[PDB]
Design a protein around this motif. Structure first.
Motif, short mmCIF file in Angstrom:
data_model
loop_
_atom_site.label_atom_id
_atom_site.label_comp_id
_atom_site.label_asym_id
_atom_site.label_seq_id
_atom_site.Cartn_x
_atom_site.Cartn_y
_atom_site.Cartn_z
N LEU A 208 0.82 -1.22 0.00
CA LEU A 208 0.00 0.00 0.00
C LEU A 208 0.85 1.26 0.00
N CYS B 87 1.84 1.73 -3.59
CA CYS B 87 0.66 2.29 -4.25
C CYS B 87 0.69 3.82 -4.23
N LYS C 233 0.25 1.71 -10.98
CA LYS C 233 -0.91 1.39 -10.13
C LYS C 233 -1.54 0.04 -10.45
N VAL D 209 0.88 -2.86 -8.98
CA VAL D 209 0.82 -3.00 -7.53
C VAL D 209 -0.54 -3.55 -7.12
N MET E 107 -3.88 -7.90 -5.10
CA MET E 107 -4.95 -8.85 -5.35
C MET E 107 -4.42 -10.28 -5.24
N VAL F 214 -3.67 -11.13 -1.41
CA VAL F 214 -4.88 -11.17 -0.62
C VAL F 214 -5.67 -12.45 -0.91
N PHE G 32 -11.07 -6.31 7.82
CA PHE G 32 -10.18 -6.34 6.68
C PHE G 32 -10.84 -7.02 5.47
N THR H 79 -13.30 -4.70 3.99
CA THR H 79 -12.61 -3.65 3.23
C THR H 79 -12.09 -4.17 1.88
N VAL H 80 -11.47 -5.36 1.88
CA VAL H 80 -10.98 -5.99 0.65
C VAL H 80 -12.09 -6.06 -0.38
N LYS I 187 -13.07 -2.87 -1.85
CA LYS I 187 -12.03 -2.37 -2.76
C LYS I 187 -12.10 -3.09 -4.09
N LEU I 188 -12.39 -4.40 -4.07
CA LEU I 188 -12.56 -5.18 -5.30
C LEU I 188 -13.75 -4.67 -6.13
N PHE J 128 -12.69 -1.70 -7.97
CA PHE J 128 -11.92 -2.12 -9.15
C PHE J 128 -12.78 -2.67 -10.28
#
Ligand SMILES: Nc1nc2c(ncn2[C@@H]2O[C@H](COP(=O)(O)OP(=O)(O)OP(=O)(O)O)[C@@H](O)[C@H]2O)c(=O)[nH]1
Ligand SMILES: */C(S)=N/CC/C=C/[S@@](=O)c1cc(C(F)(F)F)cc(C(F)(F)F)c1
Ligand SMILES: [Cl-]
Ligand SMILES: [Mg+2]
Lengths: 1015, 120, 203
Positions: free
Chosen positions: A499, A502, A511, A514, A519, A522, A535, A538-539, A542-543, A546
């Motif tokens: 991160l 990043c 970007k 990284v 990905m 994780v 966590f 949050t993952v 974030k996916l 994306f």
């Protein structure tokens, strides 16, 4: 140019020598005509009579090479047929011209091709004549070796090629009896061959004679007794003297490798010591004469001078071969410790070479080692330092894993991969295994290496795409090996550091690299994610961000990462977590439209599939069905609006946007069904009847378009789109039925509306409009519920059997899917519901037997195997009926059809890959008559005497069949073969052997009939 | 370096064999539209991936017309009187397929922009 | 431009002719027309070290159409041995082709190629393929259909024959292009109404 074909006139050699020169040294249209003239000249059966003329008078070495090719063909096939004065005469001018070329120093030097062919052509004579009609060959060969050096060297080439032809390539090309005859003959006279071979090695040192002698030695090592190697000084000569000269080094290293691979009588301390010693010597010569252990072998291989690459390849092969077999001999004794570690330090240096196939050779060894170090007590401490380097070597050369969908293109930008790299998948798996083992052997060392590498990525002193990629892929690959508490801090550090990168690294490109590494990491650490919900949440969010990314690699990987995380973490989505008002699956479903808005249709289907995996974890049936219902809200509303419109029409489907909407609704249903399986039933039931109505409606428009525009319509976008709708409806049903637990509801609710929708449609469409996926869908129906619907299986046959067989019996090429899916369907029917074939009227059952033998004749591996399997299973099916009218009439009509057709594919050369199954089928057929499991006679009442056994008629039939099929065999050859073949019908390995003997004898004339008495 | 790149797109090119009555692939790679700054004349230049061999090199002439293929919504078929990819200037019936209909439509749009530039 | 004789050997239907045609014209031939004996085809690549020409001797894999057999290998300066990863028997016969090849061509760079990797149902697994190690052959998984690693056997052979392992394929600069009628619109008609093959491919 074409005058050489005409043998009514004498052969003009000067003309021959130019058509040959035109073929090799010329080009274009002149070259093409010259090759046809040479192939017809060769293929003329009387051409061998011109071979001695060519060998004497011809000026061109290539003309002479082709003359020997014609003899090669004569000797291997029609030798026995010749008069004995021709055989003895052909031997004389071959032996006489080999020695002719060895006396001339210039011809011996410059025409090595012609000499090697003359030597090979001699060996073909030896196979025929030696030692029975040539007992003095080997003592006279040794007698000639003393006189000249060219003759001695060339005799090593003859002995090399003779060893190859007898021991290395005899299994396919000779009968069992003749291969054994030749092996014993060489084995009998090898005493005096080795005596010569060894005295030559002591008296030359380095030269072409020494190389040729070492070349033949390599071949002897494939078969000779262990006493020849270990009870002679020869290991000293190989491991010291012949290592020093580079001319002998390559071939010596290969000899030693063959020797190294042998298993040792471990009772004997002397052979053990000798095995240590040749290794000790070899390594010493490499260190003094080639390069030290510290040498940069990566740069050397990359510079590629001389044979450096071949040498390093062979060293790797020698070191790994020896050490896999014999490293325990170096592991106890403290004086042998430095030798053991030097040899491994050479592999560490070989392993740094950029060359994938070499790297795989070394990696295979490291796996063998680290595997042994994982299980063998008291071994790992020895290799601590070797292993420590290997972690660094492997971390730095990790190939891109399958999941990482971004690459650098030749321009230099971070771009979606155009295709999957199929060849690096096994290489990655191999690397992960070794790296996993090394991490287990010292978990502290591996962590330190990865963290210190990751620290230098942050400070920038070692930053690049290659370094951060390989690091991350390695970090991901070792998931599983650390403890929960160690992994906890390790993963936190890796993420928090990635991160940091990043933030610092700018651009579209940086970007994406990284993010793809974050990905990958994780997704590889589900155990971490499960223990840390905040966590995990949050993952996942974030996916979902994306999934809106303008970069397609990142977008496509986020979807694959999402699915991958949920396969492992699904349980943490169905429960209600602490601090959450509801299960997270509710939240996901709720914002599903918003989340998947920028995704392509197939990616949206993955997203739905993922939601399916989660939902199936809910074990309360009320709540699972409700979640299923909420998930399918968008596609069900789209679907309900389509049926209201399709009720009004049904011509509104012509609109291709409607076709696409429909296709994606079914595809989404297919995707949720694949993950949910049996739990999908409520969603299927909601759309089932309207769906099978749409199948008919869509099928009308397809037929209507074919009539309106022609067969070309099936290629158009609108029809291919309509065909997709049908394929996907069939896929959804196939998928559901294939996973369904409640088979009663399948039979009652689903099967009968399905068959009515698809069978009559399939049958009544033109060949080019028939979807092969109908057949596949039925294969699965019969597979799961075939026993439950015997009357439904009959309906399937009547609809698809004859019209499909007509599509695929003109040639072997057309309708390849239908071909393949057709024989799958027939296979599963014959297993599960054989009764359906009994209800076929006689003429249709004939077509069924014709259909099976048609499958035999396919080169196509998928069809051929199913063809032979149906034949096998059909015979068992008819056998188990016992002595009843249908079985009797089967055997009278079709027994000899199967015997003769199975025999055709064995014997015709073009169905080699089905040899095992053909042999088994033929054995099963022959077994029936030798157990008397055919109760009726197989013959016409007045074809043979009254009450003749089926065993007698079967031999008499086969004798006649083979006699006509192979008129060059003698009556005795056939009679012997069948005698042997029949009494070996309860012994498959010998039965197969007797067939292969037959296959060898039919390629020649005058085969020995006693060969078939081998076991 | 003599030419401005007006439009670049990934594509698969075919040529029609009239005698066999079938299409044959000529190359897969980046189809570039190259605007010559001396003459102001745009051409198609296309190279095969990896080998970098030229599979298409011709002017986007005003006379040419992009027509659909019966089997595809992401392709155009046109007649080309002078391609110099494989040496001597030959005539061909090319078709060109793209990754999507969207790309095929933008190709058509840009091909016709190029035709108006070559017309002047 | 110096020229090197390449011999291409391997079992019937392994994709040798399909591979060569693909490099010659760019086409993908779907029909299996068995080669009779040999078809010689000149084939040029452009490198940073200049043009390299191969005379590709495309030999016949079927026994009955074999022709001169090992006579095609004389004075060959390199070779490709081909097999099909979707049938074991073609990998099982690799040693027989190599054996016949190295008897004539004792010291030449050879590539072993596993064709048809684009097929889903792979029969000769990656871990099985090891024959090339002892015999010092280079190995590539390839697909003439998908063009997977299709350039690699020639790139590698070119590096060995020229003797420079930093040799790369390069693009030659293209010359500016130039600025019957009753059958050309007949072709243009039948072309528009003949469907382009493999419309399910990604391109
Ligand atoms: N799926 C797939 N099929 C291929 C590939 N390469 C070739 N084929 C097919 O397999 C067959 C191979 O034909 P050829 O290339 O003529 O076979 P060959 O090796 O020349 O055989 P001989 O001429 O008998 O030596 C053709 O029908 C091709 O379409 C490939 O990479 N993938
Ligand atoms: C830097 S790489 N910026 C662009 C991409 C951003 C990555 S971080 O926001 C990120 C990515 C992920 C991933 F990949 F979705 F799992 C998770 C996380 C977070 F830390 F878990 F939130 C952050
Ligand atoms: Cl007889
Ligand atoms: Mg061929």
């Amino acid at each position: 140019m074409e005058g050489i074909l005409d043998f009514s006139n004498d052969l003009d050699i000067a003309l021959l020598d130019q058509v040959v020169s035109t073929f090799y040294q010329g080009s274009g249209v002149q070259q093409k005509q010259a090759q046809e003239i040479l192939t017809k000249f060769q293929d003329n059966p009387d051409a061998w009579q011109k071979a001695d003329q060519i060998l004497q008078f011809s000026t061109n070495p290539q003309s002479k090479f082709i003359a020997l090719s014609i003899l090669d063909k004569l000797i291997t096939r029609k030798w026995k047929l010749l008069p004995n004065d021709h055989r003895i005469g052909i031997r004389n001018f071959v032996v006489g011209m080999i020695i002719s070329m060895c006396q001339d120093d210039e011809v011996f030097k410059t025409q090595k091709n012609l000499i090697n062919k003359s030597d090979l052509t001699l060996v073909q004579i030896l196979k025929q004549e030696w030692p029975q009609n040539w007992p003095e060959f080997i003592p006279e060969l040794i007698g000639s070796s003393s006189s000249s050096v060219n003759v001695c060297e060339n005799n090593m080439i003859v002995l090399k090629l003779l060893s190859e032809e007898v021991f290395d390539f005899s299994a396919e090309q000779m009968t069992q009896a003749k291969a054994l005859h030749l092996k014993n003959s060489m084995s009998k006279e090898f005493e005096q061959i080795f005596k010569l071979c060894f005295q030559v090695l002591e008296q030359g040192s380095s030269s072409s004679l020494i190389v040729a002698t070492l070349e033949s030695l390599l071949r002897y090592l494939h078969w000779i007794p262990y006493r020849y190697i270990y009870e002679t000084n020869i290991l000293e000569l190989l491991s010291t003297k012949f290592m020093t000269s580079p001319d002998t080094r390559a071939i010596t290293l290969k000899c030693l490798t063959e020797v190294s691979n042998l298993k040792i009588p471990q009772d004997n301390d002397l052979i053990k010591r000798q095995t240590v010693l040749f290794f000790q010597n070899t390594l010493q010569q490499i260190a003094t004469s080639v390069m030290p252990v510290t040498a940069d072998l990566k740069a050397t291989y990359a510079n590629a001078n001389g044979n450096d690459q071949s040498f390093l390849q062979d060293l790797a092969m020698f070191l790994t071969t020896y050490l896999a077999r014999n490293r325990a001999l170096l592991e106890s004794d403290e004086s042998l410790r430095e030798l053991l570690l030097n040899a491994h330090q050479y592999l560490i240096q070989l392993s740094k070479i950029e060359e994938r196939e070499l790297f795989k050779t070394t990696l295979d060894y490291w796996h063998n080692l680290v595997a042994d170090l994982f299980y063998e007590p008291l071994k790992k401490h020895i290799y601590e330092e070797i292993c420590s380097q290997l972690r660094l070597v492997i971390i730095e050369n990790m190939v891109r894993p399958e999941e990482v969908l971004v690459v650098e293109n030749d321009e230099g930008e971070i771009v979606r991969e155009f295709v999957k790299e199929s060849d690096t998948i096994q290489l990655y798996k191999s690397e992960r295994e070794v790296l996993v083992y090394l991490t287990h052997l010292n978990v502290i060392d591996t962590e330190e290496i990865m963290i210190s590498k990751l620290a230098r990525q942050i400070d920038g002193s070692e930053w690049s795409w290659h370094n951060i990629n390989t690091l991350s892929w390695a970090i991901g690959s070792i998931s599983g090996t650390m403890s929960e508490d160690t992994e906890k801090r390790f993963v936190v550090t890796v993420i928090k550091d990635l991160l940091g990168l990043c933030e610092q690294k700018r651009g579209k490109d940086n970007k994406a690299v990284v993010a793809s590494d974050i990905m990958y990491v994780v997704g590889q650490y589900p155990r971490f994610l499960k223990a840390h919900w905040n966590f995990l949440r949050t993952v996942i969010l974030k996916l979902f961000e994306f999934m809106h990314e303008t970069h397609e690699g990142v977008q496509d990987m986020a979807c694959d990462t999402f699915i991958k995380i949920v396969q492992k973490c699904k349980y943490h989505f169905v429960i209600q977590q602490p601090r959450e008002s509801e299960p997270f699956i509710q939240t996901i479903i709720r914002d599903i439209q918003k989340t998947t808005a920028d995704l392509q249709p197939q990616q949206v289907h993955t997203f739905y599939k993922a939601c399916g995996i989660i939902i199936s974890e809910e074990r309360s049936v009320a709540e699972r069905n409700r979640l299923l219902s909420d998930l399918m809200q968008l596609p069900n509303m789209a679907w309900d609006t389509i049926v209201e419109q399709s009720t009004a029409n049904p011509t509104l489907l012509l609109d291709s946007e409607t076709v696409k909407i429909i296709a994606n609704i079914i595809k989404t249903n297919v995707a949720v069904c694949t993950s949910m399986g049996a739990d999908f039933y409520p969603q299927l039931g909601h759309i089932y009847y309207n769906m099978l109505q749409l199948y008919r409606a869509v099928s009308s428009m397809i037929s209507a378009q074919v009539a309106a525009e022609g067969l070309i319509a099936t290629k158009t976008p609108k029809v291919r789109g309509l065909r997709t709708i049908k394929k996907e409806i069939l896929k959804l049903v196939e998928t559901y039925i294939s996973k369904a637990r409640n088979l009663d509801d399948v039979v009652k609710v689903l099967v009968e509306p399905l068959l009515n929708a698809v069978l009559e449609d399939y049958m009544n469409n033109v060949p080019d409009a028939r979807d092969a996926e109908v057949l596949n869908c039925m294969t699965t129906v019969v597979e799961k519920v075939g026993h439950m619907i015997p009357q439904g299986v009959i309906l399937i046959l009547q609809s698809v059997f004859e019209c499909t067989l007509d599509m695929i019996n003109k040639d072997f090429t057309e309708y390849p899917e239908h071909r393949v899916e057709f024989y799958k369907l027939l296979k599963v029917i014959n297993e599960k519901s054989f009764a359906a074939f009994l209800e076929l009227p006689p003429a249709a059952f004939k077509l069924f037997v014709d259909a099976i033998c048609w499958a035999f004749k396919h080169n196509n591996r998928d069809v051929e195997v199913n063809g032979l399997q149906i034949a096998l299973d059909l015979v068992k099916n008819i056998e188990r009926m016992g002595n009843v009218p249908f079985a009797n009439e089967f055997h009278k009509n079709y027994f000899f059809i199967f015997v003769s057709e199975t025999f055709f594919v064995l014997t015709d050369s073009d169905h080699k890959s089905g040899f095992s199954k053909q042999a088994l089928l033929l054995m099963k057929l022959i077994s029936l008559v030798y157990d008397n499991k055919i109760s009726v006679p197989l013959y016409q009442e007045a074809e043979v005497p009254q009450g003749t056994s089926n065993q007698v008629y079967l031999s008499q039939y086969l004798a006649n069949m083979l006699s006509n099929a192979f008129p060059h065999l003698t009556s005795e050859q056939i009679a012997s073969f069948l005698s042997a073949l029949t009494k070996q019908c309860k012994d498959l390995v010998v039965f197969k052997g007797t067939l292969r003997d037959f296959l060898v004898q039919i390629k020649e004339v005058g085969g020995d009939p006693t060969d078939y008495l081998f076991a | 370096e003599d030419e401005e790149v007006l439009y670049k797109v990934r594509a698969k090119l075919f040529r029609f064999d009239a005698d066999a009555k079938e299409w044959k692939e000529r190359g897969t790679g980046d189809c570039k539209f190259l605007k010559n700054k001396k003459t102001n004349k745009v051409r198609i230049l296309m190279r095969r991936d990896k080998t970098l061999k030229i599979c298409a090199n011709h002017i986007i002439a005003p006379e040419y017309t992009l027509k659909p293929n019966v089997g595809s919504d992401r392709s155009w078929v046109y007649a080309c009187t002078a391609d110099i990819a494989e040496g001597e200037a030959e005539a061909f019936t090319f078709a060109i397929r793209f990754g999507s209909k969207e790309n095929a439509d933008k190709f058509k749009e840009e091909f016709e922009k190029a035709q108006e530039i070559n017309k002047k | 431009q110096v020229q090197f004789k390449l011999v291409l050997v391997g079992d019937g239907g392994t994709g040798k002719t399909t591979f060569v045609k693909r490099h010659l014209t760019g086409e993908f031939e779907k029909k299996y027309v068995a080669t009779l004996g040999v078809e010689v085809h000149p084939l040029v690549f452009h490198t940073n070290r200049g043009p390299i020409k191969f005379n590709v001797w495309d030999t016949a894999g079927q026994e009955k159409f074999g022709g001169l057999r090992d006579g095609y290998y004389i004075q060959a300066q390199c070779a490709i041995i081909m097999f099909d990863v979707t049938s074991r028997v073609t990998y099982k016969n690799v040693p027989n082709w190599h054996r016949d090849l190295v008897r004539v061509c004792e010291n030449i760079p050879i590539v072993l190629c596993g064709n048809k990797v684009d097929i889903k149902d792979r029969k000769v697994k990656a871990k099985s393929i090891v024959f090339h190690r002892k015999k010092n052959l280079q190995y590539y998984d390839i697909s003439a259909k998908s063009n997977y690693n299709f350039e690699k056997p020639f790139l590698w052979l070119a590096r060995k024959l020229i003797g420079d392992p930093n040799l790369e394929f390069v693009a030659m600069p293209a010359a500016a292009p130039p600025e019957l009628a009753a059958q050309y619109e007949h072709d243009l008609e039948v072309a528009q109404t003949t469907a382009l093959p493999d419309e399910d491919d990604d391109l």
